């Protein structure tokens, strides 16, 4: 049912083109990235606080000192990526801020879609294509995909409507 | 476009490995938010209400 | 391409106004 909702939003609202969904995607992917990179950075800058090859038992929740080297982490990431966190508090606040901001922006976009206020089209490209039959972008291709999805899915997805689309009105490419 | 055609041809949404990827990214964002928020919530008081609490941490 | 006639001015201001806000705040810092 959720997958259906997802594809419905693509086909009818062109939700992927929506800048607010784009910011949501960025927030979610960035949150996952931050999760992975922070966990790995901490696990690979740990202090030698025990004798086992098992480094998990060299931590104590009441210990006062840092369990990993922020200095070494910062140097590593400064030389690898060009920049690095130097403030632990800022790092963890950023880890909060990124996915939460993403969720909020995508929610704003969904509010727009509730009123069919879509970022469905780029009018300039639509006009150029309507006049110039050689103008093709990935945007216009996606528009065509959306048209196909709507026509083929609506009768089954909206059975209360009693949509009757005879076979000959269904859009389709050659041989398929 | 890549994504839409990929779904049309392979039904990636109904592929469990993509389901696991979604769990990976949703959960990674969840755990990022959770960890960041718990650390930010449990910050030791080292600043005043005027300056950023970030200045409570000194590098190194 | 026949684009929205407000596109350039909107884009320029959308960038420039917060850019100058940040620039002002940064430059005066330490005063």
């Amino acid at each position: 049912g959720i997958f259906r909702f997802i594809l419905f939003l693509q086909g009818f609202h062109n939700w992927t083109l929506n800048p607010f969904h784009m910011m949501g995607v960025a927030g979610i992917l960035g949150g996952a990235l931050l999760c992975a990179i922070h966990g790995a950075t901490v696990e690979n800058t740990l202090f030698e606080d025990g004798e086992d090859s098992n480094t998990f038992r060299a931590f104590e929740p009441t210990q006062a000192e840092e369990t990993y080297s922020m200095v070494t982490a910062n140097r590593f990431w400064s030389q690898i990526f060009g920049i690095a966190f130097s403030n632990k508090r800022w790092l963890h606040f950023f880890m909060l801020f990124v996915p939460v901001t993403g969720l909020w922006m995508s929610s704003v976009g969904i509010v727009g879609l509730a009123l069919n206020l879509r970022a469905y089209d780029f009018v300039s490209q639509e006009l150029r294509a309507a006049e110039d039959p050689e103008f093709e972008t990935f945007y216009t291709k996606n528009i065509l995909l959306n048209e196909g999805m709507r026509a083929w899915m609506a009768p089954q997805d909206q059975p209360h409507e009693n949509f009757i689309f005879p076979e000959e009105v269904l859009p389709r490419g050659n041989a398929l | 476009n890549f994504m839409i055609v990929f779904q049309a041809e392979h039904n990636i949404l109904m592929h469990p490995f993509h389901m696991l990827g979604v769990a990976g990214v949703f959960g990674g964002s969840l755990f990022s938010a959770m960890h960041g928020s718990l650390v930010t919530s449990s910050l030791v008081r080292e600043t005043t209400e005027v300056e950023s609490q970030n200045y409570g941490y000194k590098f190194g | 391409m026949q684009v929205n006639n407000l596109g350039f001015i909107a884009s320029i201001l959308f960038v420039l106004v917060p850019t100058v806000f940040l620039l002002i705040l940064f430059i005066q810092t330490g005063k």
């Binding site: 200095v71 910062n74 060009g82 920049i83 690095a84 | 590098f59 | 684009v3 596109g7 320029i12 960038v15």
Partner: peptide, 30 residues
Amino acid sequence: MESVAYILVLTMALAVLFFAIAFREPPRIE
């Protein structure tokens, strides 16, 4: 002419990257 606006914003982002790397605030231990 909208191409100019796109190129401008892209260049601004890249220039910000270069300065944030080259001219960063040094991390200092103290």
